[PDB]
Design a protein around this ligand. Structure first.
Ligand SMILES: Nc1ncnc2c1ncn2[C@@H]1O[C@H](COP(=O)(O)OP(=O)(O)OP(=O)(O)O)[C@@H](O)[C@H]1O
Ligand SMILES: Nc1ncnc2c1ncn2[C@@H]1O[C@H](COP(=O)(O)OP(=O)(O)OP(=O)(O)O)[C@@H](O)[C@H]1O
Ligand SMILES: [Mg+2]
Ligand SMILES: [Zn+2]
Length: 841
């Protein structure tokens, strides 16, 4: 064995040994339990960053831990290759997005292989390849036939100067990012997933996820935004029907989640697009200007929660169906057309938004809810005004004295008796718009025929291949200007027709890639039935909480869609979630590596430290160890050159330790079996050993805290250094300690542990398996305790080292000599000195 640690030499050698053994190249082996450990596949931007390193080391630690415990572990890797960053690099360097993407994949793959991740590279996928996206095109056409995917006009942001559609992330102050021209709102036909049909399923199935973080489930619930409220109809007064047609001439319909406060309504508010707003503003210019300012605004919830709530009266009146009061209709900028009825009631006494709105305009505030002892001040807002669990109704006539739910049910029955309302469930969730006016994305498998309409491409003709020899320029998608692409024949009539030129939301590819990993070479479906039945669902998912909402929601939606199609039989894709904290680095006034002598490392400010320089300078094991040791996985990690130095010296210490042990007599059989007769020092070392094994096993398997597991192995080595292991039984225990230490650290730093193991033991490491805990090594020695009766030694008892004072009291009173000297009398007191004596008085 060589004396000094050389990661540049041993890490390539250890990587080829694993590759030649094909331990990571797994199949649907029914003779072993499966474990699917998935890390979020990266966008092939060009180079890895320490964020990738931390994420994929965490996944590799869990994967290698399960492999050592005898699991058939699948840890697949892939490339989220579609999206804008390639389209922006295409216009910068004048290259095709495909060639720019494949150059990055090939390079980033070599960077990943040099880190030693136990990856099944035979299951690699690239989402921009037709062999992949043909199956999301297939699912598109199948759901299109069922109406789950439909075509409908939607609003987009049009740039009149750049001649392109812009996302809201590129529209600032009503203007284009790289143009600055006033952005128009255009209605164009687009495609949507009817995800609202699955809202109740997407909400309730969260209860099945017993191992998800509670805040992630909370974020999913708030995004869906289910509310159980009441539809309420206010009859339009006789004097307020001018110019109103249809149902809008008779009643104003609103939606409310507080029908228990309907007796407290003092006014109602409609959206600027509501027919009551249009009819009232017909001869009032002040209302026409208000409606225009509302339309010329942002429905962005961010801007809406920060905007000044404004309103103007209309002079039109509606009638409350419970108490008969005539209420004036206001046009308000916070009422949104398209959400519910486009109109709401207002209860300023029990809704904070309505209180401030009515405080500005001096509208009445009628209390209809009391919370026991609290006092109601119409000029102040307390937090209990909107209390829904402890409130009780007042000023409600029939409903006085009821709680929220009882008043809810009673108002429901009263409104249905008069035909003026009914219970209604609503969701803030809107349908999922698929269409993107971009080139570098999955083509939409629709053919437009002037005789047949929007026609789906038959399954025999899939995929619709995206042409790769394209250099986008940013002034409109090139597909709309390529007649050789969109000119086609209608698959229903055969006449001249046009292909859809929009591409798909890149969230589509990440919504089902975890299933494609199960059979990435399958050509008869999204995923083969056999591999789907074997792998089931993802056992462990590792990625940012930034994706806790849309990505997870879309992935869960696609899982149920594919299940309903009979492709899979699981309800949820991910059983467990691990969210790693971001990696941060000091900024300088550019990469710190190009600098000589603190925010998230991202492409935005180019703070990302290139892992390849750390690998060349210290090796992959030093990189992996520093990531897992600096902080818990969920906690943020700060880049520290001092941190990578301490990690490398520990690996030098681990190497030096095994070398010095083998220099002093070579390898022997590891100690095992009965440890009676071992010296006290060697028993304590074995106790520390199997205590460390239990602690590392618990930190990998349950807590998923890797920094503490490394610290535990460090403590075991510290006690090893202070232990004389020169004797024959001493050498046997030293062999047992080192054989476990290198296996406990193998998931973190597999390169050095693989090399050290084969110098210690001739068997394959992954066949010796995860170290077991010898429970006998955890039992400490027994102690003899003196028994006293009124201070006189009456006998002795043999006590356990873990015995409580109650155990010594129980054992001291059972002593024969005690009972004989106690003369059948009780003890007014029983003093207990643990580990010395117990005296009964
Ligand atoms: N189109 C709309 N624009 C603005 N506000 C609306 C609109 N439709 C309903 N509202 C108001 O929003 C209130 C709450 O509805 P939402 O769907 O947000 O439920 P919620 O916030 O979960 O309910 P809660 O206020 O009881 O916690 C309703 O009581 C109603 O007054
Ligand atoms: N600085 C970082 N520290 C730790 N993990 C990171 C960091 N940056 C990205 N990751 C993780 O790397 C994985 C791949 O992320 P990816 O390259 O797709 O970017 P992203 O998370 O989508 O970024 P953005 O939100 O800016 O679009 C994810 O699990 C993500 O959480
Ligand atoms: Mg269960
Ligand atoms: Zn046709």
């Amino acid at each position: 064995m060589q004396e000094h640690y050389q990661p540049a030499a041993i890490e390539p050698a250890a990587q080829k040994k694993w590759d030649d053994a094909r331990i990571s190249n797994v199949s649907e082996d029914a003779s072993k339990p499966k474990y699917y450990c998935l890390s979020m596949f990266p966008y092939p931007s060009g180079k890895l960053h320490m964020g990738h390193v931390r994420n994929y080391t965490i996944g590799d630690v869990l994967s290698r831990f399960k492999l050592l415990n005898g699991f058939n572990v699948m840890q697949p890797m892939g490339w989220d290759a579609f999206g804008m960053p390639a389209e922006n690099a295409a216009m910068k360097n004048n290259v095709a997005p495909a060639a720019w993407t494949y150059d990055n994949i090939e390079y980033m793959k070599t960077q990943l292989k040099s880190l030693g991740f136990a990856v099944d590279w035979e299951r690699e996928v690239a989402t921009c390849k037709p062999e992949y996206y043909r199956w999301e095109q297939w699912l598109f056409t199948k759901l299109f036939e069922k109406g789950i995917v439909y075509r409908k006009n939607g609003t987009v942001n049009w740039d009149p100067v750049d001649q392109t559609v812009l996302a809201n992330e590129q529209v600032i102050d009503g203007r284009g990012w790289r143009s600055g021209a006033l952005i128009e709102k255009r209605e164009i036909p687009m495609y949507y997933f009817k995800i609202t049909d699955y809202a109740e399923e997407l909400l309730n199935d969260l209860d099945k996820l017993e191992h998800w973080p509670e805040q992630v489930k909370t974020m999913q619930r708030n995004w869906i935004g289910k509310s159980r409220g009441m539809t309420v109809r206010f009859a339009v007064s006789d004097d307020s029907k001018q110019g109103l047609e249809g149902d809008y001439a008779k009643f104003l319909q609103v939606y409310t989640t507080r029908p228990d406060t309907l007796m407290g309504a003092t006014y109602v508010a409609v959206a600027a697009e509501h027919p009551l707003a249009t009819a009232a503003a017909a001869d009032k210019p002040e209302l026409q200007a208000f409606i225009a300012e509302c339309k010329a605004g942002s429905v962005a919830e961010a801007d809406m929660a920060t905007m000044e709530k404004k309103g103007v009266p209309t002079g039109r009146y509606v009638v409350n169906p419970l108490n008969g009061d005539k209420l004036e209709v206001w046009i308000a900028n916070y009422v949104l057309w398209g959400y519910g009825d486009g109109a709401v009631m207002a209860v300023p006494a029990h809704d904070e938004r309505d209180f401030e709105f009515a405080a500005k305009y001096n509208l009445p505030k009628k209390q209809v809810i009391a919370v026991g002892d609290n006092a109601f001040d119409a000029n102040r807002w307390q937090e209990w005004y909107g209390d829904k669990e402890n409130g009780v109704l007042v000023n409600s006539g029939d409903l006085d004295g009821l709680d929220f739910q009882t008043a809810f049910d009673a108002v429901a029955a009263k409104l249905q008796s008069q035909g003026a309302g009914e219970p209604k469930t609503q969701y803030r969730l809107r349908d999922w718009g698929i269409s993107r006016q971009r080139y570098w994305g999955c083509p939409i498998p629709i053919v437009h025929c002037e005789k047949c309409g929007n026609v789906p491409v038959p399954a025999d003709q899939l995929p619709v291949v995206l042409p790769e020899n394209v250099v986008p320029d940013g002034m409109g998608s090139p597909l709309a200007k390529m007649p050789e692409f969109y000119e086609t024949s209608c698959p229903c009539c055969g006449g001249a027709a046009k292909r859809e030129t929009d591409t798909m939301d890149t969230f589509i590819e990440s919504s089902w890639y975890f299933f494609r990993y199960m059979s990435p070479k399958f050509s008869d479906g999204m995923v083969s039935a056999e591999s789907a039945k074997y792998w089931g669902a993802v056992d462990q998912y590792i990625g940012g909480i930034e994706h806790a909402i849309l990505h997870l929601l879309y992935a869960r939606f696609f899982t149920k869609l594919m299940r309903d199609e009979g492709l899979v039989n699981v309800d949820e894709p991910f059983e467990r979630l691990l969210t790693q904290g971001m990696v941060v680095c000091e900024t300088y006034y550019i990469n710190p590596a190009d600098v000589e002598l603190t925010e998230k490392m991202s492409k935005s400010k180019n703070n990302g430290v290139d892992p390849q320089e750390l690998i060349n300078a210290y090796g992959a094991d030093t990189a992996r160890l520093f990531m897992m040791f600096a902080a818990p996985p969920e906690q943020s990690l700060e880049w520290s050159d001092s941190g990578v130095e301490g990690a490398h010296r520990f690996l030098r210490r681990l190497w030096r330790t095994v070398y010095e042990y083998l220099k002093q007599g070579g390898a022997v059989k590891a100690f095992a079996g009965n440890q009676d007769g071992l010296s006290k020092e060697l028993k304590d070392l074995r106790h520390k050993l199997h205590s460390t094994t239990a602690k590392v096993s618990d930190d990998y398997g349950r807590r998923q805290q890797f920094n503490t597991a490394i610290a535990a192995v460090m403590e075991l080595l510290n006690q090893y250094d202070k232990t004389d292991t020169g004797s024959e039984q001493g050498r046997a225990v030293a062999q047992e300690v080192l054989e476990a230490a290198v296996r406990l650290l193998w998931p973190i730093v597999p390169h050095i542990c693989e090399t050290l193991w084969s110098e210690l033991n001739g068997a394959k490491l992954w066949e010796a398996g995860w170290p077991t805990v010898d429970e006998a090594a955890l039992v400490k020695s027994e102690i003899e305790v003196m028994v006293q009766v009124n201070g006189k030694l009456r006998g002795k008892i043999t006590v356990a080292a873990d015995a409580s004072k109650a155990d010594l009291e129980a054992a001291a009173l059972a002593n024969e000599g005690a009972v004989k000297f106690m003369e059948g009398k009780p003890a007014k007191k029983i003093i207990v000195v643990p580990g010395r004596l117990v005296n009964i008085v």
